[PDB]
């Protein structure tokens, strides 16, 4: 059991589902943010068609 617990704790960075869970939640955070960005593509290209127009601000 000393060796088995040693090899279990040495692999704590990537194997156990805890850190997998936090990296998963960061993935859904990134996906939700980028999906909120991507859903308004027509609005974004409406922003992109706005240069320095002093006549039509």
């Amino acid at each position: 059991e000393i060796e088995l617990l040693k090899l279990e704790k040495d692999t704590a960075d990537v194997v156990h589902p805890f850190f997998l869970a936090q990296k998963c939640h960061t993935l859904q955070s990134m996906n939700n943010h980028l999906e909120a960005v991507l859903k308004e593509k027509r609005s974004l290209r409406q922003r992109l068609l706005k240069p320095m127009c002093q006549e039509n601000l």
């Binding site: 617990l5 589902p17 805890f18 869970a21």
Partner: protein, 52 residues
């Protein structure tokens, strides 16, 4: 030849091997507690299934 003066030998392995048992138990308990020190934040989070 091995049955000449084996009483003191048997008792001294008995003593030092009981000692080794004691410190091995102490070190495994210490290592398990150190592992559980960084585990209690995931002890409640361990309910999620691995395959799911």
């Amino acid at each position: 030849w091995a049955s000449a003066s084996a009483k003191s030998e048997e008792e001294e392995k008995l003593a030092e091997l009981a000692r080794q048992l004691q410190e091995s138990a102490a070190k495994l308990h210490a290592l398990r507690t150190e592992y559980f020190a960084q585990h209690e934040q995931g002890a409640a989070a361990g309910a999620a299934d691995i395959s799911t």
